């Protein structure tokens, strides 16, 4: 079929990702409006409302039934390229699509780096405190 590292790229997989979504017809953020905005449902015990853009990897929760996933998406990560893409996936050029997947993989990397950075900082401050206590 279509390689399953690349599926986030098509709405159908994205909606499919919403196994249980609190919001539904009558509400502005349905799994369809969500996917259409590039969100994925990555639920957990502590937060099973958690959605994440498949492109820029921004995560967010505490959704409200009247939030519109698109403006909620511009007002949080404005630099998302996916937002700039106004054409259906199938009408994308292989070059365009490849450029896109590039930028994605990069954004993934930046996210993981930011993460490692914070983790390290925390550990840094722990160790420092300890050694200060010993003073």
């Amino acid at each position: 079929t279509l390689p399953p590292a690349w599926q986030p790229f098509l709405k159908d997989h994205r909606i499919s990702t919403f196994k249980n979504w609190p919001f539904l017809e009558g509400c502005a953020c349905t799994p369809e409006r969500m996917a259409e905005a590039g969100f994925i449902h990555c639920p957990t015990e502590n937060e099973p409302d958690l959605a994440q853009c498949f492109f820029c990897f921004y995560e967010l929760e505490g959704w409200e039934p009247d939030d519109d996933p698109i403006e909620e998406h511009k007002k949080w990560s404005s630099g998302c390229a996916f937002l700039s893409v106004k054409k259906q996936f199938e009408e994308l050029t292989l070059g365009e699509f490849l450029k896109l997947d590039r930028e994605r993989a990069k954004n993934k990397i930046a996210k993981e780096t930011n993460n490692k950075k914070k983790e390290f900082e925390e550990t840094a401050k722990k160790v420092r405190r300890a050694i200060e206590q010993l003073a």
Partner: peptide, 4 residues
């Protein structure tokens, strides 16, 4: 909505 709010950032994790």
């Amino acid at each position: 909505a709010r950032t994790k």
